[PDB]
Design a protein around this ligand. Structure first.
Ligand code: HEM
Ligand code: HEM
Ligand SMILES: [Cl-]
Ligand SMILES: [Cl-]
Lengths: 181, 181
């Protein structure tokens, strides 16, 4: 199954440390996030919100970037990666109506997304889910997990991304910080 | 709603003229195709099959290409566009694991998909839907409609595309030919 669901409420494998409502309407603070590999139609009881998305193909990265990533990126579920952060993102209509070279140019040529992210590996593990195509309120669910040593660096990464040309098109962002139970 | 559904069976706005099972396991012949702008979980009565997909953002076209397409491409549901073809396509795992430069190059540099397709506009109208990400048996639903004067041409276009480098990656294909009721 390529589909993943995230349920904020009173049960789950993760503990909510905090939520930062960076841009746009936020998400309700909850005790725990429950993550599931499937669609969930039946909104669980005592649960405040459901996010979902699917794993998909590569949209921007070229072969050499891929090769560079594969050489250093960590797997998910390292025993040390006890912190995680879920970050929903929505981009503007003006971004989606742009052609594929335009978007590529802003993503790497101008914003150096891949080159910048590479500096935070192998400390940081990541997964990218897509959800615009499902009619969700957000366009993406981004997932990061790392050992505590790296929390500082990760915060530094967030502030860099948010200073890029790419982030000018971002109209909605929440940080959900988590601790593995 | 970005989601479109296509049900083969005994009702619908389109009459099946023929089904050609070009490559891989085919689709059961039926009398009609019903086309709905939404999901359909409730498997309609006396229906052989259901295909669905969503409209999405551009994946390969650059801005100059988009401009050429917009100059000439016809709208859907022109009075004279009484013939239609629905063509589900699946591409190979080996296609999907390639990077974004690699697929772009096979699609346009080697295959000239857009340049070739542009020679058949404005006779032919088209819609493109994605569905690998929904877990369907096909990766794409393609939709073409035109007046009969253009049938021979459309047939020429199919044979050109299938000789392309792109089409070496196609592992499943069906043409459903239709007539508007
Ligand atoms: C930690 C290191 C990071 C690396 C190595 C990295 C790498 C990448 C790469 C290569 C892609 C393109 C995937 C594709 O071609 O489909 C991507 C997409 C994305 N990344 Fe990152 N990333 C990192 C961190 C982050 C962070 C911190 C955020 C947001 C807070 C973020 C947000 C995104 C988004 C939204 C996309 C999808 C872009 C779109 O389709 O418009 N990434 N990431
Ligand atoms: C009639 C003129 C045609 C034009 C102008 C045309 C144009 C295009 C364009 C510009 C794209 C790229 C969309 C993007 O960047 O997201 C595309 C994708 C596609 N076209 Fe065509 N097309 C035509 C005919 C056909 C035909 C006859 C077929 C199949 C029998 C076909 C199959 C496809 C498929 C499968 C894709 C998606 C490829 C992918 O995302 O991997 N096209 N078409
Ligand atoms: Cl990823
Ligand atoms: Cl289209």
């Amino acid at each position: 199954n390529n589909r993943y669901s995230f349920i904020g409420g009173r049960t789950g494998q993760w503990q909510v440390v905090k939520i930062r409502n960076v841009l746009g309407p936020g998400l309700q603070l909850v005790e725990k996030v429950n993550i599931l590999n499937g669609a969930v139609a039946e909104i669980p009881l005592d649960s405040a919100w459901r996010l979902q998305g699917f794993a998909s193909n590569i949209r921007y990265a070229i072969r050499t970037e891929l090769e560079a990533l594969q050489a250093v990126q960590p797997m998910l579920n390292r025993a040390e990666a006890i912190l995680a952060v879920l970050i929903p993102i929505k981009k503007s209509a003006q971004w989606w109506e742009m052609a594929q070279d335009e978007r590529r140019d802003i993503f790497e040529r101008e914003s150096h997304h891949t080159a910048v992210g590479l500096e935070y590996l192998p400390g940081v593990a990541r997964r990218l889910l897509h959800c615009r195509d499902l009619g969700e309120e957000f366009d993406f669910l981004t997932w990061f997990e790392f050992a505590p040593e790296h929390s500082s660096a990760f915060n530094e990464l967030l502030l860099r991304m948010r200073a890029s040309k790419e982030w000018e098109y971002v109209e909605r962002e929440v940080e959900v910080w988590l601790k593995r139970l």
